[PDB]
Amino acid sequence: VLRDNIQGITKPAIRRLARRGGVKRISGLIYEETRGVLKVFLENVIRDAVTYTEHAKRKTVTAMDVVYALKRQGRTLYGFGG
Amino acid sequence: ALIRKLPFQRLVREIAQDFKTDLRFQSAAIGALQEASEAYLVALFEDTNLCAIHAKRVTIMPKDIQLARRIRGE
């Protein structure tokens, strides 16, 4: 088995995502920072996903298991009453 | 997708098996996670950008990313 697959998320992939968010320039420090955040997010969601899976006496996490887990992060909007 | 799927699959497999090794995923489950991950990172960078701008800076820093996490109510 292979480890540190967070390193598999490449620099140009990170720049790609940043540009889509309107960020044109990123320094070398941003890469490992982004990887850290991504791993945390994935960990948190997969935890919640498994909870819905084990509750249904299953061993295979499904797409709907993920969706239910996603419905718990809470909805972030820009501005009030949206 | 903005990220190659095979490297993302390996990342998901690692994190999932580090939780419980006795665990499998549907391909659409990984897809759901990737779409959510990519959307989450894009939104994060948007607020990261806004942070640096309010700081009267032109280049984002590691601190802008961390502050962007806090402001999105994580």
């Binding site: 295979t60 797409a63 | 997708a1 799927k5 095979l6 699959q9 497999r13 999932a16 098996q17 499998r24 995923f25 549907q26 391909s27 659409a28 990984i30 897809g31 759901a32 779409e35």
Partner: peptide
């Protein structure tokens, strides 16, 4: 709806980690 249909495509199903049964 089109993204939902294509959501599962593109991954290595040879992986034992993936169960599409």
């Amino acid at each position: 709806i089109q993204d939902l249909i294509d959501m599962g495509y593109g991954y290595d199903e040879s992986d034992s980690f993936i169960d599409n049964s």
